[PDB]
Amino acid sequence: IKKILSKIKKLLK
């Protein structure tokens, strides 16, 4: 479960 990498998954990741 992505925490910060989640909102990031859509941004850059």
Q: What amino acid is encoded at 11 in this protein?
A: L
* Distance, CA of 13 to CA of 11 (rounded, Å): 7
Tokens 């989640």, located at residue: 6
Phi/psi for 8 (5° steps) reads: -80, -35
DSSP states of 1-13: --SHHHHHHTT--
Surface-to-core class of residue 3, CB atoms within 10 Å of its CB (0-12 exposed, 13-18 middle, 19+ buried): exposed
How many residues are listed for the chain in this entry? 13
